[PDB]
Design an enzyme around this catalytic site. Sequence first.
Site, PDB file in Angstrom:
ATOM      1  N   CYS A 279       0.750  -1.254   0.000  1.00  0.00           N
ATOM      2  CA  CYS A 279       0.000   0.000   0.000  1.00  0.00           C
ATOM      3  C   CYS A 279       0.783   1.308   0.000  1.00  0.00           C
ATOM      4  O   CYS A 279       0.455   2.209  -0.777  1.00  0.00           O
ATOM      5  CB  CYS A 279      -1.034   0.010   1.138  1.00  0.00           C
ATOM      6  SG  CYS A 279      -0.470  -0.498   2.779  1.00  0.00           S
TER       7      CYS A 279
ATOM      8  N   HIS B  81      -2.509   1.017   7.135  1.00  0.00           N
ATOM      9  CA  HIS B  81      -2.887   1.007   5.729  1.00  0.00           C
ATOM     10  C   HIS B  81      -2.710   2.393   5.123  1.00  0.00           C
ATOM     11  O   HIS B  81      -3.311   3.372   5.575  1.00  0.00           O
ATOM     12  CB  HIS B  81      -4.332   0.565   5.547  1.00  0.00           C
ATOM     13  CG  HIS B  81      -4.772   0.571   4.118  1.00  0.00           C
ATOM     14  ND1 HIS B  81      -4.145  -0.184   3.151  1.00  0.00           N
ATOM     15  CD2 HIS B  81      -5.754   1.255   3.487  1.00  0.00           C
ATOM     16  CE1 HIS B  81      -4.723   0.035   1.984  1.00  0.00           C
ATOM     17  NE2 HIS B  81      -5.702   0.904   2.159  1.00  0.00           N
TER      18      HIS B  81
ATOM     19  N   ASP C  42      -7.128   4.672  -2.759  1.00  0.00           N
ATOM     20  CA  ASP C  42      -6.969   3.679  -1.704  1.00  0.00           C
ATOM     21  C   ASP C  42      -6.616   2.395  -2.452  1.00  0.00           C
ATOM     22  O   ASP C  42      -7.433   1.876  -3.209  1.00  0.00           O
ATOM     23  CB  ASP C  42      -8.274   3.474  -0.939  1.00  0.00           C
ATOM     24  CG  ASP C  42      -8.136   2.454   0.176  1.00  0.00           C
ATOM     25  OD1 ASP C  42      -7.286   1.548   0.055  1.00  0.00           O
ATOM     26  OD2 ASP C  42      -8.888   2.551   1.172  1.00  0.00           O
TER      27      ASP C  42
END
Length: 188
Positions: free
Chosen positions: A18, A132, A147
């Site tokens: 991520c 995250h 995202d």
Amino acid sequence: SLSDFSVASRDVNHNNICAGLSTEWLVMSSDGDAESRMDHLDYNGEGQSRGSERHQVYNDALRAALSNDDEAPFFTASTAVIEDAGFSLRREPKTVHASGGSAQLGQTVAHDVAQSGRKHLLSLRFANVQGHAIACSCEGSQFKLFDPNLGEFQSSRSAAPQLIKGLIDHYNSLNYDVACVNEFRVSV
């Protein structure tokens, strides 16, 4: 609804990279359109490999920070990956706590990130100590948010609070309580 802000749905984070993917998105957030940006970051795209490489920069910095007993290892790692991409931190990383409703959290974060010209790498701290990373860029009246688990979303600066609240509610609904959001304000 969160889907109302979706411009290019794509789960490109199966490999758990991520921070790297978010930074790669920041680098080319103004290229092509939302769909082409997600195609770039998708598994058969160059962006997936570049994102993985950037995530390794993040991991390398994190490993060193933890080995050196850094007071803020994650802030150090996040700073390392954005600097590797040619950015510099404009401010001290800001931490917004979930104290209160998701609308309040979304509003506070929106006030910080939904300002013309601003770019951010953001970290979501799930109550279960899991993190995250996501990213966002505000181009004039257009607020873009990426995202890695979901894809790209867009809203006017006006509706940014609603978009961010939607993202927070999304994770909370999946039992990933967002305890706080760390903001890394960057500029080229």
